[PDB]
């Protein structure tokens, strides 16, 4: 079910191709194996079911390998990691690698504590990843940026040096790096894009971020190029979030949480075509 829905030889990734990927997810209901934190497991599964994917949440070493093996994508999230779950994630990642299943990493809290930073780095050393998604700090810490340089994230900033961090990190780890923010910056070794969808209410719902990473997994299962897959996923998810906000921006974060799930099921190819904002960043 992993086809090719866009190529740079036909132009830059756009809203049209993004909408096509969304259709593919619905059509194939890809199995997405998520080994995520226990604060967002339920929401992750429901978000994927709403979208149209098939969530599988096995996490024990007694079954992760055989499950990742037959999944369309594997998503690892270290939100409430333990020595045991990090080992299970790596066992799962190695099985996925052996069977050509794309693996996505969400380094939640990388940099907050040493254990998280080192676990993220252990996963990257032992597992070939198709994409990594996190905020600027988590990515910086995960890829090994020097301590004192990290400061270049605080204060008011959301466009510029983040573009370089994303491409440079993608080149060092030969993967796709998605740096989350109001404006998302995504890049692989040779290409960079900025994404402008979503709504601030997402910051008031736990798992909103974790769900997106798993959503990226759903798209990588149906689109061969993870850069295109991730752009289509983030765009579709953001459009759904905007439509959800429209109907529940005044009710509150509780209603929005529910509305996000509603919209992931009702968002259409036409909505993505009309609202997705994807911009190619010139790199030369």
Binding positions for substrate are 57, 207
Span from 59-67, 137-145, 177-185, 217-225 in contact with a copy of itself (CB under 8 A): 59-67
Start-to-end CA span in the chain (Å): 34
Q: Does 258 sit near a copy of itself (CB under 8 A)? A: yes
Residues pairing with 193 in the sheet: 186, 280
Q: How far apart are CA 63 and CA 193, in angstroms?
A: 37
**Total of residues contacting a copy of itself (CB under 8 A):** 54
Of the pair 72, 226, the CB lying nearest a copy of itself is at 72
One of 14, 106, 259, 271 touching a copy of itself (CB under 8 A) = 259
Q: Which tokens sit at 245? A: 């906000």
β-bridge pairing 54-56 and 31-35 = parallel
Q: How far apart are CA 273 and CA 225, in angstroms?
A: 20
* Near a copy of itself in 264-283, by CB under 8 A: 264-266
Instruction: Show Cβ contacts of residue 242 under 8 Å, excluding neighbours closer than 6 positions.
Output: 197, 198, 199, 275
Q: Does 246 sit near a copy of itself (CB under 8 A)? A: no
Q: Does 213 sit near a copy of itself (CB under 8 A)? A: no
Q: How far is the CB of 18 from a copy of itself (least distance, A)?
A: 21
Q: Does 32 sit near a copy of itself (CB under 8 A)? A: no
Of the pair 160, 254, the CB lying nearest a copy of itself is at 254
Q: How far apart are CA 229 and CA 165, in angstroms?
A: 20
One of 12, 16, 46, 135 touching a copy of itself (CB under 8 A) = 46
Q: How far is the CB of 83 from a copy of itself (least distance, A)?
A: 6
Residues pairing with 176 in the sheet: 131
Q: Is 69 helix (H, G, I), strand (E, B) or coil?
A: helix
Q: Does 20 sit near a copy of itself (CB under 8 A)? A: no
> Residue positions in the annotated binding site for ATP?
133, 180
Q: Which tokens sit at 59? A: 């996490």
Q: Does 40 sit near a copy of itself (CB under 8 A)? A: yes
Q: Which tokens sit at 40? A: 């967002």
Distances in whole angstroms, Cα of residue 237 to Cα of each of 2, 77, 78, 129, 245: 20, 18, 21, 21, 12
Q: Which residues lie near a copy of itself (CB under 8 A)?
A: 37-43, 45-46, 49-50, 55-60, 62-63, 66-67, 70, 79-83, 109, 112-116, 203-207, 250-255, 257-266
């Amino acid at each position: 079910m992993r086809g090719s829905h866009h190529h740079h030889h036909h132009g830059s990734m756009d809203a049209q191709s993004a909408a096509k990927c969304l259709t593919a997810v619905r059509r194939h209901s890809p199995l997405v194996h998520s080994i995520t934190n226990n604060v967002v497991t339920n929401f992750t599964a429901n978000g994927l079911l709403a979208l149209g994917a098939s969530p599988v949440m096995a996490y024990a070493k007694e079954e992760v390998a055989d499950m990742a093996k037959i999944a369309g994508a594997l998503v690892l999230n270290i939100g409430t990691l333990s020595k045991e779950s990090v080992e299970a994630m790596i066992i799962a990642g190695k099985s996925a690698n052996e069977h050509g299943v794309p693996v996505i990493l969400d380094p939640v809290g990388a940099g907050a504590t040493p254990f998280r930073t080192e676990s993220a780095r252990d996963i990257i050393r032992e597992v070939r990843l198709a994409a990594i998604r996190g905020n600027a700090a988590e990515i910086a810490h995960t890829v090994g940026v020097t301590d004192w340089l990290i400061k270049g994230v605080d204060a008011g900033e959301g466009g510029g040096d983040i573009i370089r961090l994303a491409q440079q990190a993608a080149q060092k780890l030969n993967t796709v790096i998605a740096i989350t923010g109001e404006v998302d910056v995504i890049a692989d070794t040779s290409h960079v894009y900025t994404l402008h969808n979503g709504h601030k209410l997402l910051t008031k719902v736990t798992g909103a971020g974790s769900l997106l990473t798993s959503v990226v997994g759903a798209f990588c299962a149906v689109e061969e190029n993870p850069l295109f897959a991730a752009i289509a996923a983030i765009s579709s998810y953001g459009v759904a979030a905007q439509l959800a906000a429209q109907q529940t921006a005044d009710k509150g974060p509780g209603s929005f949480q529910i509305e996000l799930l509603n919209k992931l099921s009702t968002v259409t190819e036409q909505d993505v075509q009309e609202w997705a904002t994807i911009e190619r960043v010139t790199v030369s």
